[PDB]
Amino acid sequence: LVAGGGEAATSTTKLKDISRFTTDDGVNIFAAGPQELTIFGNGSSATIYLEGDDTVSEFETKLSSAILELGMGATAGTSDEAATVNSNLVNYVSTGDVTDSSNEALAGTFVIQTARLGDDSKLSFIGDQNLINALSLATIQEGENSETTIKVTDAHTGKFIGSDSVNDSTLRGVIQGVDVKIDSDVGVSISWNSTKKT
Amino acid sequence: KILLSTTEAVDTSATSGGGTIAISGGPAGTTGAIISYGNNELTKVDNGDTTIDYNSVTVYHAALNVETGNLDVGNLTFNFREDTGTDTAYGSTTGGSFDLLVAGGGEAATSTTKLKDISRFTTDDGVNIFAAGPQELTIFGNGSSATIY
Amino acid sequence: MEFSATGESEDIKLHLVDNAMEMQIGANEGQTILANIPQVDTTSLGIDDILMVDQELAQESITKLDKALETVSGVRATIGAQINRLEYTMTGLDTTREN
Amino acid sequence: GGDVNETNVGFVTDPNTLASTGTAYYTVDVTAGADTLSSVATMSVYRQA
Amino acid sequence: LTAAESRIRDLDIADEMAKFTKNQILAQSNISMLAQANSLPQMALSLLG
Amino acid sequence: NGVYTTNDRAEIQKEVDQLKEEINRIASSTEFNTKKLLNGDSTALWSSDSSDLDVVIKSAVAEGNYNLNVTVDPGKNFVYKSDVMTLNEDAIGAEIVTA
Amino acid sequence: SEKLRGQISGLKRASLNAQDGISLLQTAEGGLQNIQDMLQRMRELAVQAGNGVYTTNDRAEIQKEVDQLKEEINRIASSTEFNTKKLLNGDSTALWSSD
Amino acid sequence: AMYINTNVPSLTAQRYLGETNNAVSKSLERLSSGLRINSASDDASGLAI
Numbered sequence A: 001l002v003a004g005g006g007e008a009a010t011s012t013t014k015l016k017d018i019s020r021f022t023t024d025d026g027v028n029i030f031a032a033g034p035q036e037l038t039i040f041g042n043g044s045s046a047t048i049y050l051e052g053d054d055t056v057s058e059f060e061t062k063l064s065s066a067i068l069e070l071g072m073g074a075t076a077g078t079s080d081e082a083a084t085v086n087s088n089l090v091n092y093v094s095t096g097d098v099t100d101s102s103n104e105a106l107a108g109t110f111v112i113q114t115a116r117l118g119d120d121s122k123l124s125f126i127g128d129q130n131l132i133n134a135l136s137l138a139t140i141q142e143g144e145n146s147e148t149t150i151k152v153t154d155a156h157t158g159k160f161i162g163s164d165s166v167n168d169s170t171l172r173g174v175i176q177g178v179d180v181k182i183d184s185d186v187g188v189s190i191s192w193n194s195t196k197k198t
Numbered sequence B: 001k002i003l004l005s006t007t008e009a010v011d012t013s014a015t016s017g018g019g020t021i022a023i024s025g026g027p028a029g030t031t032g033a034i035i036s037y038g039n040n041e042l043t044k045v046d047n048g049d050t051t052i053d054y055n056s057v058t059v060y061h062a063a064l065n066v067e068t069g070n071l072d073v074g075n076l077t078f079n080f081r082e083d084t085g086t087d088t089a090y091g092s093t094t095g096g097s098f099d100l101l102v103a104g105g106g107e108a109a110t111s112t113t114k115l116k117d118i119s120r121f122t123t124d125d126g127v128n129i130f131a132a133g134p135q136e137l138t139i140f141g142n143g144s145s146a147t148i149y
Numbered sequence C: 001m002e003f004s005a006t007g008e009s010e011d012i013k014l015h016l017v018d019n020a021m022e023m024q025i026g027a028n029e030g031q032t033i034l035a036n037i038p039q040v041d042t043t044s045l046g047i048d049d050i051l052m053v054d055q056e057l058a059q060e061s062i063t064k065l066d067k068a069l070e071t072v073s074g075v076r077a078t079i080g081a082q083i084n085r086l087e088y089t090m091t092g093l094d095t096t097r098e099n
Numbered sequence D: 001g002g003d004v005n006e007t008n009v010g011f012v013t014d015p016n017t018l019a020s021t022g023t024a025y026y027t028v029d030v031t032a033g034a035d036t037l038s039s040v041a042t043m044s045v046y047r048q049a
Numbered sequence E: 001l002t003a004a005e006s007r008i009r010d011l012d013i014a015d016e017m018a019k020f021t022k023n024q025i026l027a028q029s030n031i032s033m034l035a036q037a038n039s040l041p042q043m044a045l046s047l048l049g
Numbered sequence F: 001n002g003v004y005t006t007n008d009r010a011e012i013q014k015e016v017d018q019l020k021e022e023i024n025r026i027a028s029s030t031e032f033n034t035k036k037l038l039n040g041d042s043t044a045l046w047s048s049d050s051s052d053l054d055v056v057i058k059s060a061v062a063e064g065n066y067n068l069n070v071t072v073d074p075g076k077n078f079v080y081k082s083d084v085m086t087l088n089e090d091a092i093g094a095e096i097v098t099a
Numbered sequence G: 001s002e003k004l005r006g007q008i009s010g011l012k013r014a015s016l017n018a019q020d021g022i023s024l025l026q027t028a029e030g031g032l033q034n035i036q037d038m039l040q041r042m043r044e045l046a047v048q049a050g051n052g053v054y055t056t057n058d059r060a061e062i063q064k065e066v067d068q069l070k071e072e073i074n075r076i077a078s079s080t081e082f083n084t085k086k087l088l089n090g091d092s093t094a095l096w097s098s099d
Numbered sequence H: 001a002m003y004i005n006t007n008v009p010s011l012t013a014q015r016y017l018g019e020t021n022n023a024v025s026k027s028l029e030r031l032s033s034g035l036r037i038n039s040a041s042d043d044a045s046g047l048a049i
Helices: A056-069 A080-087 A129-135 C058-098 E013-048 F008-029 G002-048 G056-079 H008-033
Strands: A002-004 A035-041 A044-050 A090-092 A110-113 A124-126 A138-141 A147-154 A160-166 A178-182 B002-006 B020-025 B030-036 B055-064 B071-080 B137-141 B144-148 C014-018 C021-024 C032-035 D009-016 D026-031 D040-045 F053-057 F066-073 F079-081 F092-094 G094-098
Touching: A044 A056, A056 A080, A056 A090, A124 A129, B002 B030, B020 B055, B030 D040, C021 G002, C058 F008, C058 G002, C058 H008, E013 H008, G002 G056
Parallel strands: none
Antiparallel strands: A002 F092, A035 A044, A035 A124, A090 A110, A110 F079, A138 F079, A147 A160, A147 F066, A178 F053, B002 D040, B020 B030, B020 D026, B055 B071, B071 D009, B137 B144, C014 G094, C021 C032
C-alpha cells in the first residue's frame, strides 16, 4: 500500500521529511547538525543523539535501549515474559495496527510506558526548545502507589511486636528510634496482554 | 559427615521438548547429579520475529567443606535458545557441553570467601583496612590474654 | 564516474589514557576532589570549515555560531559551580581547626 | 580450556552463594535425550580427628 | 530588548555604597578588638607571675 | 518563573548536584579522636542481609534480631502519548498492509 | 596529644591547598571569557555579509580578516599556561594517539 | 584559668577579619567594574540570557 504525502507516516520514513520537524521559516532542525535528548528518571540521566537520516524504527529501538539502560525495564526474571515486556515498552502505531477503545486508538503516535509503580515511574525530558515543542508530549495515565502490609516478629521466640498497612512503604513508629525503607520491586509479577495491549 | 548425590530414571526419549543437565567439576572435582526435563520446557516457538527470545531455568548446587563440614548452597539461571521447533509439532533442542567461569559468590558470605571482599570491612571513605597490613586482635578472659593476627 | 566498495575491510588502532586532576582536601587518606577541563579549540567548536564567498553560507554560519556560544557558556558555568563548591568548603576546615 | 559452543545456551544470570574463586572451571553438560538409570555415587566425607 | 537587557547591568549604587560603608565601619572595630585581645593575656599573667 | 528554556534548569541542576555532594562530604568527614560523630556511629549500629532495605537512625534503639513479613497490593504507572506525525507535500511512503 | 597535633598539621596543609587550587580555575575562567568576547564579534561580522549589494571582492575582503580572527582564537586556545602545564588543549583530562 | 599562649580569641578575631576583608574586596571589585554578574560564578543563569 503506497500512501502519498500531505497522511500517516510509515515505518521506513526518514526523520528529515516529517512536517513537524521544520520551523515556520522552513529551516529544519537537522540542518545544523545532530540533536541531543536528555532523559531524567529513577535518580539518573541518559543522553541520546539524533541524526537527520534515521527512520522511525531506529528511533524506537534507541529509546527502548536508553530506557532499559536506566534499569526501569523488566527485572531479572529473565523469561520470555521479560523479553516481550521489554520489546513492548515504546510503541509506534501504523494505519494497519489501530485498535479501537485502547491506548492505541490514534494513528501514527508514540506510546510510552514504564515497568515500575508509583512515583518511580515518572519520566522527564530535556532538550532544545524547538525539538521539545515539536515532540509535544502529553499524559494519558498517571501513576498510583502500592499498599504494603508489614508484620514484625522476634527471631528466636516468635512473640508478636507489631503490624501496619502503609502506602509509601516506610515502616515508622513500631521499632523505637529507627525508620526502615523497603523497595517497591518486591512481590510483584508483570504480564503483557496483547488482546487489549496493556 | 557423608554427602551423597541421587539420580532419577527418566524416559528422555520423546518426539522433542526437553533435555538433561549435568553439573560437574570444581575445586573438589565433584561429579554432581543429572536432571531431566519434559516437553517444550527448554525452547519456545517463533511468533513472526520474536525480537530474540530466551527461556529461563533455575539450578541449585551444593558443596561440602572438608574441615568444618558446613554445606554451601547456590543457584543460577540458564537462558536457553530463542525459538526452535519442527513443522509446528513440539519443539527442538541442541545437546553438547561447554565451560563456565565464576566470580564472586552472590548475596551472602560463603565458607571460602576471601576476607578482603566483605563489605563490612571497608570504611565510608573507600579505603579498606587490610590494605596497609595485618591487624591485631586481643582477647581477655579468666585472668589471661591472647593476641591473633 | 563510478564509485565502488573496495571489498576488504580496514583496521585501525587507537590508544587512550587519562590525565585527570587530583586535589587533596583532607587530613587523612581517602578524601579528595577530582578536576577536569574539556578540550576547547576551533575543531571542538566545529567551525573549521566556515566560508564566506557566496550569499548562501551566512545562515549556516549564524546557526553554528549560536551552537558554539551556548557550548562555551555551559563550560564557563560548570567552572563557576566548581569554584563555588571550593569556596564553601574552605571555611569548615578553619572552624574545625579552632575547635 | 578450549572448546566451542556446541549447544544453544545464551548466558547465565543470578549467581548467588555458588561458592567462589571461579578458577576450577565448571562443566554444564546439556544432553538432548539419553536413557537414565537409578544409581548412587559417594560425593564426599568429613572427619575431624 | 535593550531595555530588557539593561536590567541586569548594575545595582542602584546607593545600596552598594551602603554595604561598603557598613563593612568599612565594622573593620576598624574588628582591628581594635583584636589589638586589645592580643594585649591582655601576657601582661596579666606576667603580672601574676 | 517561566522565561527560561529547558536548558537553564539543567544548568542549575548541575550546581545543585555539586552542593549535594559537598553536604554529603561534610556529613561523612567529621572527626574527633578517630570517632566519627554524625555518621550514625554515636547511637546505634545496624546491618542486614537483603540488598533492598534501608535503615535511618533517629533516637535510641532497643536491641536484638527481628523477622519481617511483607505482603503487597499493587498500584499503577504513568502512560504518555505523543502527537500525530504526517508527511510533507512531496513525500512518498510505502507499507505492508493486509485486508 | 600526638593524634591531635598530627590532625592540626593536616588541617593547615589542606587550608593552604584550597586556595592553591582556586587560582587555576580563576585563570581558566579569564581565558574562556576572552574567547567568548571574540566569538560575538565573529557573529556580528557574520550577519554583516549576506546582503545583495556587494560584489565578490567585498566578501573576500571580509574573509581575510575572518581568517585572521580564527588564527588569533586558535593561538589563544593553544597559549594558556600555568606552571609548565597547559590547560585548555586537552592535557588535563586525557591523552590519545593513533597510527 | 590563666594559661600561656592559648589566645583562642585571637584566632576567632583573625577568622572574622578574614571574612570582612574578603567582603570588602569583592564590593570594591563590583563597584570598580560597574557590572552585576562579572566573572562566571556570581550567577550561572544570567550569562546565557
